[PDB]
Amino acid sequence: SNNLDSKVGGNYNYRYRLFRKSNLKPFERDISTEIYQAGSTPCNGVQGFNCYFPLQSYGFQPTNGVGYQPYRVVVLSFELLHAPATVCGPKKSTNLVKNKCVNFNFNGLTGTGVLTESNKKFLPFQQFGRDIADTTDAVRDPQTLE
C-alpha cells in the first residue's frame, strides 16, 4: 500500500509497540503507554535511565525499499462450528426452464421432475407443497415468487 499509506516525510500516524515486559498472547490487544523498565531499575517519571515509551511510529515514505514500504493487512478471522451458522458462501442460481425433465434444486430441495406453472396458491411463508401421501408435489421459486 505504498501508493496509499506512505507520506513523503514519513507517515508517523501509523504505529507499533516497540517495547513490552513480556511477549504477548494470541489475539491480545494492548493500549498501554506507561513507561517500560529495560533494566532492573524502577523507572519513574516521563524520562530516565533505562526508561522507554513502549510505542513507536513508522517512517512510511513513497521512496522506501520494497519491504520498508507499508502493507495493509485484513485477517478474515472466524471461529467455527460450535453454534448455528450465520454467514455462509454464495449460492449461485441459473435460469428456470419449464416443460422439460430435470434434476431440480430449490433452496436445497434437490429432486427430479418436470416443472410446470401451478395454479395452487400458497400463504406467503410456505416454500413447498406436499400431497396426500406426504410426498412433495410442488415448490415456490425463491427468486421470482411463483
Binding site: R15, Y16, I31, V74, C88, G89, P90, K91
Partner: protein, 49 residues
C-alpha cells in the same frame, strides 16, 4: 473492510464484526490488488462452498 477510507494502526488494530449475510469473494481473490492472500486450513476456491 478493504476499500475503507483509512486503515487502523497496529498498536491499536481495528476489530470489525460481521454477520447475517453472504460472503462472495468473486471480486476478492480473483482480483490482483492483493500481493498476498493465504488461507491456513481451507482452499480459497472452496470458500464459496
Amino acid at each position: 473492510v478493504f476499500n475503507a477510507t483509512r486503515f487502523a494502526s497496529v498498536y491499536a488494530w481495528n476489530r470489525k464484526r460481521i454477520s447475517n449475510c453472504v460472503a462472495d469473494y468473486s471480486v476478492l481473490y480473483n482480483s490482483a490488488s492483493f500481493s498476498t492472500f493465504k488461507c491456513y486450513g481451507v482452499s480459497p476456491t472452496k470458500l464459496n462452498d
